[PDB]
């Protein structure tokens, strides 16, 4: 919620989630772990510096 994907406080909409163990159990999925400051709502950071 701080470095990857942030929703605005006045959100209107639905959220769905489901398990995908049998199709997505592989290498190649990453998330950002270090960053200077938080991102703003509906923003993306694709840098790899």
């Amino acid at each position: 919620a701080d470095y990857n994907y942030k929703l605005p406080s006045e959100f209107v909409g639905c959220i769905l989630a489901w398990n995908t163990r049998t199709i997505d159990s592989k290498r190649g999925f990453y998330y950002r772990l270090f960053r200077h400051g938080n991102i703003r709502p509906y923003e993306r950071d694709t840098s790899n510096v």
Binding site: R40, Y42, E43, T46, S47
Partner: protein, 244 residues
């Protein structure tokens, strides 16, 4: 996307200052109202403030001096342009404006309006090129990779210059909120060489989901299009102001 171009004839920008009269108001919401008087807080350009002016033309000494510095984009920008030959095609939005961060380009190819977001390698001088009167090449960047957004709207515009007096004034307002870039537009045809005083209100035009950190922009002057193999520029003026 073709790439590269170099200009030595350049000179220092002058950075004039001009009065803003009562321009730079826009429709701030999507609620229809009828015969009502309202009090609204927001971000607007104050009446009577100074704003900055830049120009572009060949003066006389076998040399052309443009004016494309890098400007801050804090809380929003008011843009104006006086032109007569389809000069100012687009802008560049971003943070470092190099190949280490994502950037957004809004331009015109005299056939479509293009909006793209990618890891751009910007050139030293972005501009298009016409073949006297034929869209020739475009030298705005040489390489673009790892790229997120692409969209185009067909809009064919005339590429035959009519130099002389100023025939068009175009005004824009740029805002950024919650990953959305908001563009408001207004246009008119006048016959004068300054900005007339008055009160103009700008209509909404575009709401784009870019999702990119914006703190700085610069202007693309694709003016050089009217020659053969040598490529030089006609005249144009533009104005910049901020929001409070």
């Amino acid at each position: 996307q073709d790439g590269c171009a170099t200009l030595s004839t350049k000179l220092t920008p002058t950075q004039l200052q001009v009065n803003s009269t009562r321009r730079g108001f826009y429709y701030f919401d999507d609620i229809y109202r009828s015969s009502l008087r309202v009090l609204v807080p927001g971000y607007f350009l104050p009446f009577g403030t100074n704003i900055t002016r830049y120009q572009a033309q060949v003066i006389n000494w076998t040399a052309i001096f443009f004016d494309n510095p890098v400007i801050p984009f804090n809380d929003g920008v008011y843009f104006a342009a006086l032109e007569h030959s389809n000069v100012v095609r687009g802008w560049i939005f971003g943070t470092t404006l190099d190949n280490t961060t994502q950037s957004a380009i809004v331009v015109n190819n005299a056939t479509h309006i293009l909006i793209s977001v990618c890891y751009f390698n910007v050139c030293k001088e972005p501009m298009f090129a016409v073949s006297n009167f034929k869209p020739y090449k475009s030298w705005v960047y040489d390489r673009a990779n790892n790229c997120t957004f692409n969209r185009a709207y067909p809009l064919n515009i005339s590429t035959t210059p009519e130099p002389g007096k100023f025939k068009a004034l175009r005004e824009q307002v740029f805002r950024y909120q919650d990953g959305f870039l908001y563009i408001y537009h207004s246009y008119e045809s006048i016959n004068s060489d300054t900005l007339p005083p008055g009160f103009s209100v700008l209509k909404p035009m575009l709401k784009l989901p870019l999702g990119l950190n914006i703190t700085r922009f610069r202007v693309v002057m694709a003016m050089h299009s009217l020659t053969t193999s040598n490529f030089n520029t006609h005249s144009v003026n533009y104005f910049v102001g901020h929001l409070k």
